[PDB]
Amino acid sequence: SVVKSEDYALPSYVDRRDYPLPDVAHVKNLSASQKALKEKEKASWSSLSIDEKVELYRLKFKESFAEMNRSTNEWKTVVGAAMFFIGFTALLLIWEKHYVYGPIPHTFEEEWVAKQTKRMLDMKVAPIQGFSAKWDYDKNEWKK
Amino acid sequence: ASAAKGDHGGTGARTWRFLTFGLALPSVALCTLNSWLHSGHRERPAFIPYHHLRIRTKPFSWGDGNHTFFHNPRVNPLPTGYEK
Amino acid sequence: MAYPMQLGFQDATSPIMEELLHFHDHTLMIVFLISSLVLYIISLMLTTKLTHTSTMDAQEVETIWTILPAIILILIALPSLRILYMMDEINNPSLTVKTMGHQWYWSYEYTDYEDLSFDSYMIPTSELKPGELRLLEVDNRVVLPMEMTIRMLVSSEDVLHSWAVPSLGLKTDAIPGRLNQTTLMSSRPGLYYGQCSEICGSNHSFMPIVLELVPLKYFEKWSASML
Amino acid sequence: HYEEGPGKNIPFSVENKWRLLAMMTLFFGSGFAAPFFIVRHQLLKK
Amino acid sequence: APDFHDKYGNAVLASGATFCVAVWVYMATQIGIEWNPSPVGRVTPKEWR
Amino acid sequence: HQTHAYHMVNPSPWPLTGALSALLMTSGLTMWFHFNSMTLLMIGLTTNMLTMYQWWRDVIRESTFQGHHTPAVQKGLRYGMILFIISEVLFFTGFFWAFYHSSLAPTPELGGCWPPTGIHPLNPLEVPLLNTSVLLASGVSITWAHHSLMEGDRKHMLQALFITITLGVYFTLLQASEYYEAPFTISDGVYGSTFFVATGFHGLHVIIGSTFLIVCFFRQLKFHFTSNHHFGFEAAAWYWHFVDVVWLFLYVSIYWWGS
Amino acid sequence: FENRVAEKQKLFQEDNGLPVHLKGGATDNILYRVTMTLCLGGTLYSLYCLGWASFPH
Amino acid sequence: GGVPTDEEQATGLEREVMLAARKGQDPYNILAPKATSGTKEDPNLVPSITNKRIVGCICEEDNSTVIWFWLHKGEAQRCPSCGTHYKLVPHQL
Amino acid sequence: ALAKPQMRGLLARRLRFHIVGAFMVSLGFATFYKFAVAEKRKKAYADFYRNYDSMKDFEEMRKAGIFQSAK
Amino acid sequence: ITAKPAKTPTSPKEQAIGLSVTFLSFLLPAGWVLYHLDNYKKS
Amino acid sequence: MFINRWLFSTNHKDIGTLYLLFGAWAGMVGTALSLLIRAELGQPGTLLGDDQIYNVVVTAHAFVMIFFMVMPIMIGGFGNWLVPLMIGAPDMAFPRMNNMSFWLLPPSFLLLLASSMVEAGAGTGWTVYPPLAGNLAHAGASVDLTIFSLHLAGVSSILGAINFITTIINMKPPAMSQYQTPLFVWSVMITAVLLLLSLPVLAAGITMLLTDRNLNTTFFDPAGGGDPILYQHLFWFFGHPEVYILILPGFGMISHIVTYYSGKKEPFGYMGMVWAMMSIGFLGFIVWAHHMFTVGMDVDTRAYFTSATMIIAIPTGVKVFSWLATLHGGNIKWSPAMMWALGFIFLFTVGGLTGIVLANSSLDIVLHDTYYVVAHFHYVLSMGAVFAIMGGFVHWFPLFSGYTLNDTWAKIHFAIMFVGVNMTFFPQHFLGLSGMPRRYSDYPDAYTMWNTISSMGSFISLTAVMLMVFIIWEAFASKREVLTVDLTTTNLEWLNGCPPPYHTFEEPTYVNLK
Amino acid sequence: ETDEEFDARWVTYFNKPDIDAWELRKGMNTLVGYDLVPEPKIIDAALRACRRLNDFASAVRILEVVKDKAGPHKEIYPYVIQELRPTLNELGISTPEELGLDKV
Amino acid sequence: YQTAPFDSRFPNQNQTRNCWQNYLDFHRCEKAMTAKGGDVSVCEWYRRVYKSLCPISWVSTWDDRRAEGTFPGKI
Numbered sequence A: 001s002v003v004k005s006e007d008y009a010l011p012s013y014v015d016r017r018d019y020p021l022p023d024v025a026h027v028k029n030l031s032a033s034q035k036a037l038k039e040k041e042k043a044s045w046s047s048l049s050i051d052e053k054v055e056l057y058r059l060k061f062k063e064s065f066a067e068m069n070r071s072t073n074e075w076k077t078v079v080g081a082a083m084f085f086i087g088f089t090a091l092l093l094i095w096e097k098h099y100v101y102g103p104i105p106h107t108f109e110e111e112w113v114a115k116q117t118k119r120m121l122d123m124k125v126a127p128i129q130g131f132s133a134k135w136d137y138d139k140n141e142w143k144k
Numbered sequence B: 001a002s003a004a005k006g007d008h009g010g011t012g013a014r015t016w017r018f019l020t021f022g023l024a025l026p027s028v029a030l031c032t033l034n035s036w037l038h039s040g041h042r043e044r045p046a047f048i049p050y051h052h053l054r055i056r057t058k059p060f061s062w063g064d065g066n067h068t069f070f071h072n073p074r075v076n077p078l079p080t081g082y083e084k
Numbered sequence C: 001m002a003y004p005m006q007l008g009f010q011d012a013t014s015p016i017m018e019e020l021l022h023f024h025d026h027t028l029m030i031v032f033l034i035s036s037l038v039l040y041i042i043s044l045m046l047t048t049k050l051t052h053t054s055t056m057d058a059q060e061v062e063t064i065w066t067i068l069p070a071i072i073l074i075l076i077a078l079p080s081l082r083i084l085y086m087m088d089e090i091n092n093p094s095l096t097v098k099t100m101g102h103q104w105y106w107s108y109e110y111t112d113y114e115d116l117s118f119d120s121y122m123i124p125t126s127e128l129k130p131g132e133l134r135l136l137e138v139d140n141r142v143v144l145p146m147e148m149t150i151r152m153l154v155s156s157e158d159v160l161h162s163w164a165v166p167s168l169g170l171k172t173d174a175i176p177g178r179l180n181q182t183t184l185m186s187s188r189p190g191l192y193y194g195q196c197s198e199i200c201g202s203n204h205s206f207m208p209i210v211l212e213l214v215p216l217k218y219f220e221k222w223s224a225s226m227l
Numbered sequence D: 001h002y003e004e005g006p007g008k009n010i011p012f013s014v015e016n017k018w019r020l021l022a023m024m025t026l027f028f029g030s031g032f033a034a035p036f037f038i039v040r041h042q043l044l045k046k
Numbered sequence E: 001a002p003d004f005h006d007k008y009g010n011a012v013l014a015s016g017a018t019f020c021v022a023v024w025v026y027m028a029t030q031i032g033i034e035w036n037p038s039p040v041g042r043v044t045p046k047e048w049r
Numbered sequence F: 001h002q003t004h005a006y007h008m009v010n011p012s013p014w015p016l017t018g019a020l021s022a023l024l025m026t027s028g029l030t031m032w033f034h035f036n037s038m039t040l041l042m043i044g045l046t047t048n049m050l051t052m053y054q055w056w057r058d059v060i061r062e063s064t065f066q067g068h069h070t071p072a073v074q075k076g077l078r079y080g081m082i083l084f085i086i087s088e089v090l091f092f093t094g095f096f097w098a099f100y101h102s103s104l105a106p107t108p109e110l111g112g113c114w115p116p117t118g119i120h121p122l123n124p125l126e127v128p129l130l131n132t133s134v135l136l137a138s139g140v141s142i143t144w145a146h147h148s149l150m151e152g153d154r155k156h157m158l159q160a161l162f163i164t165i166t167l168g169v170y171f172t173l174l175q176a177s178e179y180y181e182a183p184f185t186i187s188d189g190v191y192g193s194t195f196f197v198a199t200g201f202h203g204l205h206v207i208i209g210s211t212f213l214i215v216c217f218f219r220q221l222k223f224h225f226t227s228n229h230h231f232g233f234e235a236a237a238w239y240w241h242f243v244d245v246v247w248l249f250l251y252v253s254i255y256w257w258g259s
Numbered sequence G: 001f002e003n004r005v006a007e008k009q010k011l012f013q014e015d016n017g018l019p020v021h022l023k024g025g026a027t028d029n030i031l032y033r034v035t036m037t038l039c040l041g042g043t044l045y046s047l048y049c050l051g052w053a054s055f056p057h
Numbered sequence H: 001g002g003v004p005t006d007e008e009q010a011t012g013l014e015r016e017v018m019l020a021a022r023k024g025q026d027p028y029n030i031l032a033p034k035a036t037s038g039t040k041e042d043p044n045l046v047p048s049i050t051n052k053r054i055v056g057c058i059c060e061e062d063n064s065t066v067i068w069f070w071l072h073k074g075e076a077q078r079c080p081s082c083g084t085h086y087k088l089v090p091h092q093l
Numbered sequence I: 001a002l003a004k005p006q007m008r009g010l011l012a013r014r015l016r017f018h019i020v021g022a023f024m025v026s027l028g029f030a031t032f033y034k035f036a037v038a039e040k041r042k043k044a045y046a047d048f049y050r051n052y053d054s055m056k057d058f059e060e061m062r063k064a065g066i067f068q069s070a071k
Numbered sequence J: 001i002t003a004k005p006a007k008t009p010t011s012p013k014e015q016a017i018g019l020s021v022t023f024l025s026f027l028l029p030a031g032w033v034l035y036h037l038d039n040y041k042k043s
Numbered sequence K: 001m002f003i004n005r006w007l008f009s010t011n012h013k014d015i016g017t018l019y020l021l022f023g024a025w026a027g028m029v030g031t032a033l034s035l036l037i038r039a040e041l042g043q044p045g046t047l048l049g050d051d052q053i054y055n056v057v058v059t060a061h062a063f064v065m066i067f068f069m070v071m072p073i074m075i076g077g078f079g080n081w082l083v084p085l086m087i088g089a090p091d092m093a094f095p096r097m098n099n100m101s102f103w104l105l106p107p108s109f110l111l112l113l114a115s116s117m118v119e120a121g122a123g124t125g126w127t128v129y130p131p132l133a134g135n136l137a138h139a140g141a142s143v144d145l146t147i148f149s150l151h152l153a154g155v156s157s158i159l160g161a162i163n164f165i166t167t168i169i170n171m172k173p174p175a176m177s178q179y180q181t182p183l184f185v186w187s188v189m190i191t192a193v194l195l196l197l198s199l200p201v202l203a204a205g206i207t208m209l210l211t212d213r214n215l216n217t218t219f220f221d222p223a224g225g226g227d228p229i230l231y232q233h234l235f236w237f238f239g240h241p242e243v244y245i246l247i248l249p250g251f252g253m254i255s256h257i258v259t260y261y262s263g264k265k266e267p268f269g270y271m272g273m274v275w276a277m278m279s280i281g282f283l284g285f286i287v288w289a290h291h292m293f294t295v296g297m298d299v300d301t302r303a304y305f306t307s308a309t310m311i312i313a314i315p316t317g318v319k320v321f322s323w324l325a326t327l328h329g330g331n332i333k334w335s336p337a338m339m340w341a342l343g344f345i346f347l348f349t350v351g352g353l354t355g356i357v358l359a360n361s362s363l364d365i366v367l368h369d370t371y372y373v374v375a376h377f378h379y380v381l382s383m384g385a386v387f388a389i390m391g392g393f394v395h396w397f398p399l400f401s402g403y404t405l406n407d408t409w410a411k412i413h414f415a416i417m418f419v420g421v422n423m424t425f426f427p428q429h430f431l432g433l434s435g436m437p438r439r440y441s442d443y444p445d446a447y448t449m450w451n452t453i454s455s456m457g458s459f460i461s462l463t464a465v466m467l468m469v470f471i472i473w474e475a476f477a478s479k480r481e482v483l484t485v486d487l488t489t490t491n492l493e494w495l496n497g498c499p500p501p502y503h504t505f506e507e508p509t510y511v512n513l514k
Numbered sequence L: 001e002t003d004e005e006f007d008a009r010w011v012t013y014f015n016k017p018d019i020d021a022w023e024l025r026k027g028m029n030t031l032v033g034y035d036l037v038p039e040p041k042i043i044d045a046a047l048r049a050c051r052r053l054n055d056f057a058s059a060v061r062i063l064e065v066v067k068d069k070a071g072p073h074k075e076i077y078p079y080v081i082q083e084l085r086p087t088l089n090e091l092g093i094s095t096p097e098e099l100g101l102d103k104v
Numbered sequence M: 001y002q003t004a005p006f007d008s009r010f011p012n013q014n015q016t017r018n019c020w021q022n023y024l025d026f027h028r029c030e031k032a033m034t035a036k037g038g039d040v041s042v043c044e045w046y047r048r049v050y051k052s053l054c055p056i057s058w059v060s061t062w063d064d065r066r067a068e069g070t071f072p073g074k075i
């Protein structure tokens, strides 16, 4: 049952799908009844009860395949916590925009943009696909 | 090449000392002779303030900042010309 | 110029720039394929409880994954080098124009016949006229004749700069003591923007390039009035 | 000869997790603050 | 026996998601950020010359 | 107690003093170039000499006096030196690259020719030839020294080594003189730049190699070397050969082909 | 000269638990102390210099 | 003459390695041990100076993968990969 | 009674099936790209310059007042 | 990997304190410099 | 005791720890600088000041991340800790010199910080090109201090590389050939060879710049017949190999992480992985001018450098495929380390592929000196090198400390960083195709959107960095001591427990020659 | 080598009367590394080897590994158990399902 | 004369020698004619070319130097 730090050089127990039979038994010290059970196991296994069969399994192994292979709810904690700290990050960006950043250039004002946009079209910026191609120079509007 | 001599039977200390006194040092005495002969001050050339020479983009960290480290008055003009 | 939210290349203004759009498309396809193939296989390997942990043999599958990528490289190189050698073909220019980089503006020299030269400086944001582009407008534009083969010679009189105009597929570094050549040829009239493309000190971000492409006849009159 | 084993093969102490918090904070905090304060310094020169 | 994720899993997920979306939506739209989207389809060109 | 043949070095303060002395030399050069003062430099140079002296002192203690250099430790040291020389050769490569870059495509500023206009090169058949014979000779005399040491001949080992060092010193003096006589300087454009910096780093290495041969000389005087175990001498002799080879390339490149 | 290696071997092998840098006796300590004082002194000095050079004059 | 020999002047571990080699021994593990048949009755004898030593097993010639495990004083142990046998032979040097 | 199922090479068999799938998708996507991006791009350029009148384009620009050299 | 239970367990409350303190050691000084950028720029 | 242990060390594990600590601190400095970068660019306008202060920040960001964070952690930390263990060696060949490799770095770092303190800093780019780096456009101590910093960092790595090469050639068990060493050990030696050959060339280059600045040489000055372009050749002759130096140890740790969490006893195609690293190592020496496609070189030269640069994809391809083939049929353990490794495999491939776009000189005319280059290199550095460091760090933390991390917290840290770096760098592809140049403090208005998003992404990244400190704290505060570790039969470094004793392999392993 | 030769090698392997505990474990741990669920005849020889080494738990553990090696092919395990029923009955080996060890 | 034609001796992106060579050519030609009592106008081509190609500051710096005695080129 109880594993110690300074036992690192000795064979150990592991529950792994691809290592079904570990180097040692899960339980190495047996009580009086456990000893009796290991003796009984030398006889026909048909004489072993369900509870005794289970008990022998548990001396040899720690978890069953179904146990070691079980899925968890950890993903909820990871994804949820991720989103939380990504959430936290917007608090920083809010603070930054309030206290650090001054106003942006006057060239983003609505009217400035309207005029600059006209000019871009007058100069046929990206006339093949990018920009002006998306303006109808006849109906005088953005292509629907 | 194989040079023009011989030994090779065994390359040991005696051979290498033979080479030291019989070939190497004699070559050095020859080139010492040749040199202490073709030497003697060659007439310094006319000064011309060429722009790719006597460079100064920052003064030197010694003397008056305008003299090269192993400045020789006889042969090394300053950016303005030879010295007095 | 670039427009808001732009994803890809500025529209081609020269035949060479068109050529690069197609080559980029061809390459990006290969790039999407292989990265999506890798992403896919990754997910394939991680989605089964079936296992096989014993030693696997490598000297057979290593052939495929050596020969395929080699082939795909050759399929990128072929068009890559074709365009490269095209960009180098002899072309016989009708006009030579020089540009000197300075901290922090460009000067132009049109010295085939007369001695024409001027400085080109970024319009300060506070002096932009309505609808003019922040950081991009210059006081004296680079008037050039459209539909003609021009020779652009580029150099610098202080630190490195680099003369770029993305819509024409141009970027020639400007190095003091050296004279770099490139050829320019706009298929269209108009205004074509670019920005200094080598870190050059305090105002590297603020020394743009505006080309004005008008007909020969308007270029000649402009030249004259500019003497 | 020296101490060996968890918490003993390092030049900082992990005996008290709060004193350790304070150390780590000084250590990672000083590193992250340095550029901000060099910027400040450069803006207050000219 | 239930661990942290069996006890708190659904809550961490639900409120982490809720909070994330709330504060990003608020930052994206209420504090005066300029996103500079394409004029195409949104801006009416105005006379400049 | 260990059962491998490798050396577990006692904790040492020399890495730290060598590091700090590096900080003082570089910091000192900065203070010299920009703040007209040499104090820092003087200090860093002093500690560096002290560091180098104590650190190699201890290597001698650990090897000759304490016996820690088993054939395996010795074999590690051969690799370390081979690798060290390799990195030194690449360093010189940078400077040859610079010479060949400038001299093969001379710019308009120099008159578009090599040597540049207004530059009058030394005659490669004069002191440069002498210097060459001096180095080539010292290569012979150090081989003689190696064979003497291996044949257990104390007197002729010391005699050949002496000769080797004196040649080393002669080269240095000749080169010092030539430096002073040269009508061109380091400020004489790319010609002066490539010339003095390449040969000047070479001359630095001739000084280092020489110093190292001298150390070998005194260790031999005190019987440190056995006819079979003498890695310090081997190192110095490899290094000395590297130095001779670098000179043959400078000679052929800059003095002969470059004139 | 006479071969005195064996004495030096005796001296440096002597079981006194002293690190090789100090094993030669009292001179080692002096020289160590001088080295390390110049190093730590000079470093303090360089910091001062850096502080000086950080501001305009 | 005049130049010491290793015989006269080698000291410390250098001398130890040199003397031991002359008697044909390897106390300092400079040589790679030769394998036995590695059976139960012919296990590879692994010298040690404590009660356990790490063994590296190159199961088949030219494997690039080396199988590592602690070999303890006691009954022979087998390579977890190829089952060959090794037995610790403690002490001395 | 149940029939003997397949018990050997399940992983390899699974690998075979999906790599062939990944190939098929790749060709399917190549097709798509070289239609939705590549050809779309070549055709837009070819269509734009087919009957493109540069003097007319210039004139519209000139009349909009964008030019320094041409009023 | 297997390990033993924490020799000195760190409760949620304690983790909150450590998280908070950690964030604040990165955030406060940079915040302070950034907030005062304007008073630096023209001074 | 303390001073003898930590200032006078001769112990490869202690020195490795000094390095991890140095690197972690540098990593913080480098993160600050990068946030300065994205703060300035997070909205249109000027935040700090002109391009001088901005480029001082950009320049230090690079020098710090490369020479103080990546190289020290990878070669100094993981290299010293693991390499001796992996070959059953008692220490490094030159444990004393190894300590000086360490102690040269704080002084070197001091000189970098100094240079930014005096005058107006070195706003030159990490490439330090003249004439901008020269005594006229960058007058005073700043650039000289930067050069000296590089000298010290360079001596440090060159001495490091000599140690590693000698240790790996000379100190394996007598029965182990070079073809029985793990791939991390291989990756470290090939990196060491690259360091040994390339740093002295950089040394020569920056010394020439030093003398041009202070002794009136004219290596890069046309007035004396020099050539600014020559400098570029010398720098890049080192500069390209340098990137392979930054990624190779990465590849090594990826191989171990992927093998381990795949429940596999060995990596697929070992000899093909060895061949691959050597090839990348060699090819990486004949391609430097791909950093110079716009300086005006002959078309034949640009054709050679385009082709030689592309060929590097073959060997790199073999590695990527082999890592997948290692996962194939694995018993997959979804640890934090394995998540970093998976992320690495994919993101590195993307950065690698955009590196191939840039190999084409034709296209590069338009891509050079724009954010397209910046996106390529952060994929392979912020999502390549850094992802290998994170994976290796969480994987091996328990060996180094004897304590375990909270797996769940570490999975959270990975998710946050994953979102962060992708949001920072993906949109930079857009900025670059559309023409945003490098090394700009402000940009034309059209580029505002991608710069806003990319800055928001850098903040997410900040959050992950802060969280990481906390996670390292929690581990040391809770003290969950390591018991058992699986797969020790093919992971020698774990076989002496956690942490291994000060002295290990006092009695060397026994390995039969057969 | 052919499929039948493979199976035979493994049958013979587990059938060695004096097979010890280490060989039992080695054989099972090796076998599960392959891309197959072992044929019933192989599993039978290993179960009986469990009998001769008085190891009931390893017999159950072995049935579990068969199930595991089938991954999502839910049809393999019930076929294998069906083919081993005489053997299970003869030795009194309960299935993991019968022992309750298949429930998480 | 429109501009300096393609010159097969200088086919690459670096045109520095092209400028330099024609500058030298013109001034050597000018010297030869002004020596031998001849017309400088034969030299005209080279002046047009070098004027097309060479930066103003280069030409101006080189003219000042010829006047000063410090022109490193051989004329």
Ligand SMILES: CCCCCCCCCCCCCCCCCC(=O)OCC(COC(=O)CCCCCCCCCCCCCCCCC)OC(=O)CCCCCCCCCCCCCCCCC
Pocket: C007, C008, C009, C028, C031, C032, C035, C036, C039, K350, K354, K422, K423, K426, K427, K429, K430, K433
């Ligand atoms: C963050 C900002 C996003 C903004 C989106 C666009 C707005 C639409 C407007 C409206 C869009 C429609 C109209 C405009 C068409 C313009 C066409 C053009 O000019 O053409 C060229 C343009 C356009 O290219 C595109 O067409 C965009 C492709 C975007 C790829 C999507 C992967 C994104 C993954 C998940 C989210 C992103 C963050 C994660 C990044 C992960 C790294 C890939 O520019 C590029 O070249 C950028 C790509 C750089 C190369 C990276 C290559 C490898 C990528 C990764 C493979 C993942 C495979 C699996 C799939 C990946 C699943 C994980």
Ligand code: HEA
Pocket: C034, C038, C068, C069, C070, C072, C073, K127, K243, K244, K246, K247, K290, K291, K309, K310, K312, K313, K314, K316, K317, K318, K320, K348, K349, K350, K351, K352, K353, K355, K356, K358, K359, K360, K364, K367, K368, K369, K373, K376, K377, K380, K381, K384, K385
């Ligand atoms: C860890 C760092 C790292 C790595 C590993 C690389 C790898 C590559 N790099 Fe990059 N790079 C940097 C870090 C790196 N780089 C940095 C900092 C800079 C800019 C320097 C500066 O200017 O400041 C930079 C700059 C830079 C430039 C100059 C661009 C410019 O400035 O204009 C170029 C150009 O060729 C370049 C190209 C390449 C290429 C081909 C590779 C290749 O090695 C990558 C190959 C990998 C793959 C291809 C992916 C996997 C392969 C397959 C799945 C098989 C199939 C593939 C095909 C068939 C294509 N890099």
Ligand code: HEA
Pocket: K020, K021, K023, K024, K025, K027, K028, K031, K034, K035, K037, K038, K058, K059, K061, K062, K063, K065, K066, K069, K070, K073, K124, K125, K126, K127, K374, K378, K381, K382, K385, K386, K389, K390, K393, K421, K424, K437, K438, K439, K440, K441, K458, K461, K462, K465
């Ligand atoms: C390894 C190298 C590296 C790394 C990791 C980064 C990381 C980042 N870089 Fe860096 N960058 C460069 C190297 C690097 N960069 C280089 C070389 C340049 C070009 C310089 C020049 O032009 O001259 C550059 C340029 C550059 C620019 C262009 C500047 C311009 O052209 O104007 C930008 C802009 O956004 C940017 C941003 C970032 C950001 C936001 C990160 C973030 O992703 C960072 C988030 C933080 C980390 C990823 C830290 C990780 C590790 C630790 C903290 C150690 C932890 C400790 C242990 C495990 C022990 N970078």
Ligand SMILES: CCCCC/C=C\C/C=C\C/C=C\C/C=C\CCCC(=O)O[C@H](COC(=O)CCCCCCCCCCCCCCCCC)COP(=O)(O)OCCN
Pocket: B068, B069, B070, B071, B072, B076, F029, F172, F175, F176, F179, F180, F181, F182, F183, F184, F185, F186, F187, F196, F197, F199, F200, F201, F203, F204, K151, K154, K155, K203, K207, K210, K215
């Ligand atoms: C006799 C031959 C032996 C040479 C050594 C002699 C002593 C001088 C001092 C140290 C030389 C050390 C290394 C070489 C570095 C600089 C070039 C020196 C070569 C030299 O000595 O050239 C001299 C110029 O010296 C000058 O500027 C002198 C400048 C003196 C200060 C040295 C500059 C310090 C910067 C050194 C760089 C260090 C970086 C190396 C890093 C190592 C790798 C990490 C030539 O003199 P001149 O008057 O111009 O012409 C003679 C005309 N009559």
Ligand SMILES: CCCCCCCCCCO[C@H]1OC(CO)[C@@H](O[C@H]2OC(CO)[C@@H](O)[C@H](O)[C@@H]2O)[C@@H](O)[C@H]1O
Pocket: A092, A095, A096, A099, J027, J028, J029, J030, J031, J032, J033, J034, J035, K035, K036, K039
């Ligand atoms: C790129 C990385 C940057 C990350 C973003 C930083 C995130 C949050 C920073 C918080 O810290 C600060 O917040 C303040 C308030 O919000 C400040 O107080 C200032 O503000 C006050 C109130 O407005 C006064 O009480 C004080 O005098 C004070 O100087 C200031 O000191 C600073 O420490």
Ligand code: CUA
Pocket: C101, C102, C104, C160, C161, C162, C196, C197, C198, C199, C200, C201, C203, C204, C205, C207
């Ligand atoms: Cu000029 Cu940047």
Ligand SMILES: [O-][O-]
Pocket: K239, K240, K243
């Ligand atoms: O350098 O990529």
Ligand SMILES: [Cu+2]
Pocket: K239, K240, K243, K287, K288, K290, K291
């Ligand atoms: Cu490169």
Ligand SMILES: [Mg+2]
Pocket: C162, C197, C198, K294, K368, K369
């Ligand atoms: Mg560039």
Ligand code: NA
Pocket: K040, K041, K042, K043, K044, K045, K046, K047, K441, K442, K443
């Ligand atoms: Na800005």
Ligand SMILES: [Zn+2]
Pocket: H057, H058, H059, H060, H067, H079, H080, H081, H082, H083, H084
């Ligand atoms: Zn074996």
